[PDB]
Amino acid sequence: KQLSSKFGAISSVLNDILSRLDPPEAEVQIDRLITGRLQSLQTYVTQQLI
């Protein structure tokens, strides 16, 4: 479910969001989405570890 979260971005998709945005802002949006998904994965692996 957390894969489909927007995480403050315009859209949760990956291939479609590359065409609609220029790289100087697409890089920032992708970096924000990757950091949010990595934080979600960190929460998941912490729960799995405990």
Partner: protein, 50 residues
């Protein structure tokens, strides 16, 4: 400091490395080009522009 003799600089905006501190920096093999801007696309010389 010798580059100010011909004409004062107009734009002076630099991205990335700071132009204020350059005497303490070390580098090699720099590239120099020369072209013209007609006046209304001075900001177009930047990454991500069209």
């Amino acid at each position: 400091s010798v580059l100010y003799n011909f004409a004062p600089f107009f734009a002076f905006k630099c991205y990335g490395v700071s132009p204020t501190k350059l005497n303490d920096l070390c580098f090699t093999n720099v590239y120099a080009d020369s072209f013209v801007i007609r006046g209304n696309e001075v900001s177009q010389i930047a990454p991500g522009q069209t």
